[PDB]
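Annotators were shown the component list below and the corresponding predicted structure, then asked to write short factual statements about the assembly.
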Amino acid sequence: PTIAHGDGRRPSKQRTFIVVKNCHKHHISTEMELSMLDLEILHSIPETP
Amino acid sequence: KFEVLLGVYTNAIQYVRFLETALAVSCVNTEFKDLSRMTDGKIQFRISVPTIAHGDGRRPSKQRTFIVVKNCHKHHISTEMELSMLDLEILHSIPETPVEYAEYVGAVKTVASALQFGVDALERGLINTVLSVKLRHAPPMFILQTLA
Amino acid sequence: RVPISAAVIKLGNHAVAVESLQKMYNDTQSPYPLNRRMQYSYYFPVGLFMPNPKYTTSAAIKMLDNPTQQLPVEAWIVNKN
Amino acid sequence: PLNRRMQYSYYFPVGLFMPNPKYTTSAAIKMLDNPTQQLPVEAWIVNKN
Amino acid sequence: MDLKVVVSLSSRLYTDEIAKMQQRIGCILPLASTHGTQNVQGLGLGQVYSLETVPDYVSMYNYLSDCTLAVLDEVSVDSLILTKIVPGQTYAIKNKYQPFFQWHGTGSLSVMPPVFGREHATVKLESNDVDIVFPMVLPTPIAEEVLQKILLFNVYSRVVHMHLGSVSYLGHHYELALPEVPGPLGLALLDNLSLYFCIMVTLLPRASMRLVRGLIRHEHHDLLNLFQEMVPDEIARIDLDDLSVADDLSRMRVMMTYLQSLASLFNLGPRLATAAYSQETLTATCWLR
Amino acid sequence: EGVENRPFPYLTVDADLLSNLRQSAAEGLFHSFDLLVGKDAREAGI
Amino acid sequence: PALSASSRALIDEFMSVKQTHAPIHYGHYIIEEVAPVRRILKFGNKVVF
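Structure shown to annotators:
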């Protein structure tokens, strides 16, 4: 909005700001390890206590 | 792979009003509007202050009346609103298809956001000229700690 | 009638209101007419000569020159910083 | 991340020269030297300890 | 199209000031801004022409060239209303200026700094501390000789000067005030004229000297009366050359462009093209040229 | 400068996000913005 | 009056003792500034109000 002024000045008309905001992108990654001996037992079936 | 528009927003312009603010405590809004119609901007008051009836034979304590004239301040408050002509070309063109109905509703909303701009500009210009009147007839406190 | 948003303070017997139109002018990005300018004139001399019956009033300061003949030629003033 | 640090630059002059109309603004500092012919060779500063 | 400026006062205009402004209705006034509501402090020519400094008229000419022009139609309490001047509309301008130049020929008018004095068009406001000076409106045949008197007083300060100080008209002679120093921009215009002349003096022709020599020794026109029957020697030593047409034709083309540039330099201030002037009603229907 | 101006249906929030805006856009807090004064402040053509 | 002096020594003594400072020392003067605004001065750490 704008104030109407009585003193002679250069009057700003109906202004309108169009400001956009672009998103960010955060990509996080840790790195875990697993032994192959802990997978060759995971992908078998046991018949022993 | 797409490009998301995460929402779209505009601000609500708050409706200020001169009779809603407390600057109108110090102003009485007369419904007379004849001092705009009156040619001369003066009004003459026959005020009459009291007097202390003194008893010693110095001078007779004549009555006091003052014919004081208060000139009225007429201020002119003017804004402008540049409005596009191809908004008028849709304002007069009757719409039939729904796309030109949406474009005509947009043209009416652009027009109704300029008349509202004018009314919101003359309720801020009114407060501005009233506040500049109260700052023009405001002598400083370092004068009126003693002159008053 | 309607409630008017205006903080009312009591100064003796009058209950005046306190209203700020700063939000009204900050939505215009127009200056509020109560942030006024105040220009006072500051004057100071430079190069004066104190008359020949001379004196001090401080036993702390001890300059290393002749006290009878010494003239100010500059005036060290301070900034706003 | 809220245990951050600062980089303040500290500057100090070493061995300046006071101009010739020499003064002082204190009692109770009496040096056994010539006050007209005085020159700083050092600048005693203070550690964080 | 609303073309109407409401210049508003801060303080109350007294009755004698109302009479003095009602005496001046229809006169040209230059404005600061072109907008609908203005203030008095900035109306008129007083911001460039002040009492404290010297009257410099060349900056007033460029001020009248740059800023807009308005006529004064209505004056009342606390406010006086003006009408702007745009191209494409015909305006009524009355002759209310104190050195009276009669517009009998319906010639093109010209808007001038108040060279004839301030105090006759100074019209003073004791409401607010401002002085409204009205620019002089007058035909361009008077305007060229007033501008040449302004430009010639500064170069004839060194070396009869009452002829250059006053103006010439058909009916009367009026006194216009000259300063002892023109100012910075008047000295700039005199400097540009001096550089133009000191460059163009070598690009003068040679054939017309033979014309003026044979015409002085042969047949006196009414226009040949200035020489008092005498020729200098510079004419002779540039007439020790023979005449050709090619260098003179190139020199006359560059002389055409230089005389057009001098027409650009002398044409200062706004001009108004009058049509159907009424001498009995004393107003003139004019538009901006 | 990276901004489109289409006749979007703009949701009308009530935030006071006019405060220090014409000075903040001048210094460059916004990476990409369009100032539309006069006739450009319109819900544009579709 | 602004804060004027005639030497740096009267400036250095103005901050040391605000009450018992000498306005005149034999030929030099110091003019303590009065104003509608009580501007606060800092020379190192010696502040005057």
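Statements collected:
1. Chain C has one helix and two strands.
2. The two ends of chain C are 53 Å apart (CA to CA).
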